[PDB]
């Protein structure tokens, strides 16, 4: 069996940075507001990942309402996320991730942002992408208002 | 043997009175979806996914604005006449997996329902079909409250 | 028997004069899209999906907007040498799914034309690309006519 899924997240700028983006700290002059850590390439990932196994969302494993959440380590989350996915039986094919924002430049973290993930799912670093894209001053993440991240998973058996 | 994939996007604005339709399920509101039929984002964006990964083009491409019959239409029957066609083609449901942007309303108590509809207009197994929301943080026009958009993923098989 | 998913986003704004290349089909518009290259955002968002599922990053880290060699850069020829990268590692075509976010111009007279190329580029059947176009309705940067934005999934297969 093959399983596909799809994650979707987005997070507004606000107070100080750092961000906190694929587990890594980039220097910012803006943070990310967020009930969690507010890691939005961890939480679209995890939502792939859950979807991809019907499990729900985020949303569903880990309220926003729930104060033992509260700054949470999406990573923490995203391993969580994976070991409920494991015990339906399901094992990693390949990850995605699209991280779509004006800045903070992405690129020179993403070798550290795949470390991160690889280690979390306990997988090869050539099962895990991430990328970056502008949206060219165009939207809320080209007006510098916030950042969003997609992913895909494909999930095997 | 072979294993395809599909994407479909969608979105509507708001507009008139509630309640909206989303995955089938009516979800009271304060206001409706502006449409040609019921309004379902949902369903829209999964169709295009499913014809999508069929290499069949698009849900206006079998179903236009255009024409008067399409008018209040019932999403759900625009799926499964989509499915069928599909079918007629040869593939089978892999999964699908389904992401509704919106900040409002909460759609998390309906997604249980939604999955019910959908299993059944594709004839598959609930657990091949997942369904999840999310909101923008008031960012852009779903932040704001202008509309809701929605995401589908679909694997088909031959 | 190993496959894999891809997932790709691309936005360009709207400048300057029409004609705008979109699929690699000129098409005739009031503006034209700004870019280093030629503004492909469709071939933009289908390089990004392949190259994400062959794990190979992304076209801004293969092909710097920094460098002077990629300005005017014709979309296709970068689609053609992210996907010789791919095919060195060992992958072939599953197949892929293009969904095209604009208000105007209108896409569908040139979609037929698109396929063929992308069919062409990554030496597959046409079979195996589709390609859709929808508005947002008028909502957000693409709604005001401000770009168009671009989606696209693959499944490659080792
Ligand atoms: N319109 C919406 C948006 C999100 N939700 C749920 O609430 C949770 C929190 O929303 P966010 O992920 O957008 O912060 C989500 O994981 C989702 O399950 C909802 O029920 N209705
Ligand atoms: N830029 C666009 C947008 C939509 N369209 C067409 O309009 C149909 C319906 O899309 P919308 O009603 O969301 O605009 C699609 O099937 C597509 O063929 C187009 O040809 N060019
Ligand atoms: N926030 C961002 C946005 C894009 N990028 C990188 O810059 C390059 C070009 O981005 P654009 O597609 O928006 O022009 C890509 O390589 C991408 O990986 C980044 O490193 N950080
Ligand atoms: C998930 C996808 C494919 C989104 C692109 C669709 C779109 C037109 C967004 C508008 O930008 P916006 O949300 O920032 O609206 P605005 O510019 O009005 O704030
Ligand atoms: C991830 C969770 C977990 O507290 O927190 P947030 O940091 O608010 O992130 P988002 O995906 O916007 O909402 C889902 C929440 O469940
Ligand atoms: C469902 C159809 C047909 O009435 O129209 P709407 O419900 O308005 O949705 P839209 O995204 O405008 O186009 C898709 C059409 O197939
Ligand atoms: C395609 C490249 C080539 O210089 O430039 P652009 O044409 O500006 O397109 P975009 O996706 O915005 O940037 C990535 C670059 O690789
Ligand atoms: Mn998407
Ligand atoms: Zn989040
Ligand atoms: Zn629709
Ligand atoms: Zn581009």
């Excluded at 990850?95 to 924002?101: F, G, H, M, P, Y």
Aim: a negative charge; proline letters at 4%.
């Amino acid at each position: 069996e093959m399983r596909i899924g799809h994650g979707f997240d987005v997070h507004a700028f606000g107070g100080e940075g750092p961000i906190i983006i694929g587990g890594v700290r980039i220097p910012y002059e803006k943070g990310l507001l967020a009930h969690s850590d507010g890691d939005v390439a961890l939480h679209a990932l995890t939502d792939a990942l859950l979807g991809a196994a019907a499990l729900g969302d985020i949303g569903k494993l880990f309220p926003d309402t729930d104060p033992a959440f509260k700054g949470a380590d999406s990573r923490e989350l995203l391993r969580e996320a994976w070991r409920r996915i494991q015990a339906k039986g399901y094992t990693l094919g390949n990850v995605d991730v699209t991280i779509i924002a004006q800045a903070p430049k992405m690129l020179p973290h993403i070798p550290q942002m795949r470390v991160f993930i690889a280690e979390d799912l306990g997988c090869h670093m050539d099962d895990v992408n991430v990328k970056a894209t502008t949206t060219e001053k165009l939207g809320f993440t080209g007006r510098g208002e916030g950042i969003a991240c997609e992913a895909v998973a494909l999930l095997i058996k």
